């Protein structure tokens, strides 16, 4: 909204730029995690701490 355009002239470039649509477990299945994947590409600064 323009009201949070005005107070997002106050908070941040990345302060309220986000909203939740996280990839979750589908409804009904429930297991455990056995394998995770790591894939990163040279340019844009892998995190630390971490």
């Amino acid at each position: 909204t323009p009201e949070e355009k005005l107070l997002r002239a106050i908070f941040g470039e990345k302060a309220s730029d986000v909203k939740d649509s996280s990839l979750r477990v589908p409804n009904g299945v429930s297991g455990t995690v056995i394998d995770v994947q790591v894939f990163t590409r040279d340019g844009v600064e892998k995190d630390k701490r971490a």
Binding site: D17, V25, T32, V33, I34, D35, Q37
Partner: peptide
């Protein structure tokens, strides 16, 4: 989106 996507394998006891 923002903050990332990772491939995750799930194992369910059938």
């Amino acid at each position: 989106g923002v903050l990332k996507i990772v491939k995750v394998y799930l194992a369910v006891k059938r």
